[PDB]
Amino acid sequence: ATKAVCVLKGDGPVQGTIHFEAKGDTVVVTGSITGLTEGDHGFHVHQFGDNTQGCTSAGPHFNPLSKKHGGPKDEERHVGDLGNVTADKNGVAIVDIVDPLISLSGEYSIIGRTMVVHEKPDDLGRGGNEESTKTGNAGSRLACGVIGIAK
Amino acid sequence: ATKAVCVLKGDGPVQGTIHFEAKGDTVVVTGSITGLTEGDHGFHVHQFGDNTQGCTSAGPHFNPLSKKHGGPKDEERHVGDLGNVTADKNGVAIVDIVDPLISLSGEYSIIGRTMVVHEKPDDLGRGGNEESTKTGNAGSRLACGVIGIAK
Ligand SMILES: [Cl-]
Ligand SMILES: [Cu+2]
Ligand SMILES: [Cu+2]
Ligand SMILES: [S]
Ligand SMILES: [Zn+2]
Ligand SMILES: [Zn+2]
Structure with a gap:
C-alpha cells in the first residue's frame, strides 16, 4: 500500500484529515488539524485501531521494538x-x-492503527521523569482516527 | 493482524461494534448492530478505509478478484x-x-478497509437487474467504520 488516510475525531472540537504516502523508504504525512489551542500538541501512531472506548482503546504508542519514547x-x-x-x-x-x-x-505498517493528537506538547522523551520516557507527557487524547487504505 | 475491530457510526441512529478473529484460513466475525429496522440489512467490506465523506468515500464492495456480487x-x-x-x-x-x-x-486483508451496513436487504446477486450484480440492491449506507488492528 502506498496511500492511506485518517479522519481525526474526539469528544470536543478537534478534527482533521491526515494523508499518508509511501515515498522511497519513508512515509510522507500531510494534512491539517483544526480546533486546537495555539502552540504544540503531541502527535503519534498508537498501536490499536480500536475506537470502542474512544481514543482510550487505541492503546500505547506503536512500539514493536520496545524502546523508550523519543522524538522523530x-x-x-x-x-x-x-x-x-x-x-x-x-x-x-x-x-x-x-x-x-x-x-x-x-x-x-500503520494501516489499521490509530493516529492521536494530544492536549499538550510532547517533551520528546527529555522531561526527566518516567512518564517522559513512555508518553512524552503529551497529556489527554483530544482526537483520533483509524488509519485506512486510500484510493 | 490476527484480531481486528470496527466501530460503526453514521448520520442516523445505527451504530455497532464488529469483531474479527483469524482461525486457520477463515475469519470469525462477531458483534452487534443497533438502531436498525426489523429484518435483513446488507453487510459488506468496502474497498477504502476513507471516512472523509461519511460512508460514501468507502468506495465499492471490496473486490480484488473483479467478480460479480453474490452471497457469502x-x-x-x-x-x-x-x-x-x-x-x-x-x-x-x-x-x-x-x-x-x-x-x-x-x-x-481487510485491515484498513471499511465495514458498511445497509438500508435494505442484500438480494445476494439474485435480483435479476444490473444493480443486483454490483451491490445486491441493498440501498443506502446507514453506518460504517474503518477496520482496525485489535489487541
Ligand atoms: Cl467492486
Ligand atoms: Cu499519542
Ligand atoms: Cu456494502
Ligand atoms: S454499495
Ligand atoms: Zn512514544
Ligand atoms: Zn458485493
Missing part, C-alpha cells in the same frame, strides 16, 4: 513517535512530516 | 460480500459469520 529525530524512539504538530493563532496545525520509521506495509 | 455462500462473489445481518423487533442485529474469503493479513 532520535534513534531511541517508538515507531509511532511523530513529535509535535503546531497550531497557529487560529488553531490550525499544518501537518507536514516525512518519517523513515513508520511504514504503510510490512511489519511496521 | 456463493462461488461468484466479492471478497467483501458478507450477506445480510438480521435485526429483531428492538432493532438489534447479532452478527455471527465465519468467512473463508476475507482475511486479516496478506493479499485479501
Whole structure:
C-alpha cells in the first residue's frame, strides 16, 4: 500500500484529515488539524485501531521494538513517535512530516492503527521523569482516527 | 493482524461494534448492530478505509478478484460480500459469520478497509437487474467504520 488516510475525531472540537504516502523508504504525512489551542500538541501512531472506548482503546504508542519514547529525530524512539504538530493563532496545525520509521506495509505498517493528537506538547522523551520516557507527557487524547487504505 | 475491530457510526441512529478473529484460513466475525429496522440489512467490506465523506468515500464492495456480487455462500462473489445481518423487533442485529474469503493479513486483508451496513436487504446477486450484480440492491449506507488492528 502506498496511500492511506485518517479522519481525526474526539469528544470536543478537534478534527482533521491526515494523508499518508509511501515515498522511497519513508512515509510522507500531510494534512491539517483544526480546533486546537495555539502552540504544540503531541502527535503519534498508537498501536490499536480500536475506537470502542474512544481514543482510550487505541492503546500505547506503536512500539514493536520496545524502546523508550523519543522524538522523530532520535534513534531511541517508538515507531509511532511523530513529535509535535503546531497550531497557529487560529488553531490550525499544518501537518507536514516525512518519517523513515513508520511504514504503510510490512511489519511496521500503520494501516489499521490509530493516529492521536494530544492536549499538550510532547517533551520528546527529555522531561526527566518516567512518564517522559513512555508518553512524552503529551497529556489527554483530544482526537483520533483509524488509519485506512486510500484510493 | 490476527484480531481486528470496527466501530460503526453514521448520520442516523445505527451504530455497532464488529469483531474479527483469524482461525486457520477463515475469519470469525462477531458483534452487534443497533438502531436498525426489523429484518435483513446488507453487510459488506468496502474497498477504502476513507471516512472523509461519511460512508460514501468507502468506495465499492471490496473486490480484488473483479467478480460479480453474490452471497457469502456463493462461488461468484466479492471478497467483501458478507450477506445480510438480521435485526429483531428492538432493532438489534447479532452478527455471527465465519468467512473463508476475507482475511486479516496478506493479499485479501481487510485491515484498513471499511465495514458498511445497509438500508435494505442484500438480494445476494439474485435480483435479476444490473444493480443486483454490483451491490445486491441493498440501498443506502446507514453506518460504517474503518477496520482496525485489535489487541
Ligand atoms: Cl467492486
Ligand atoms: Cu499519542
Ligand atoms: Cu456494502
Ligand atoms: S454499495
Ligand atoms: Zn512514544
Ligand atoms: Zn458485493
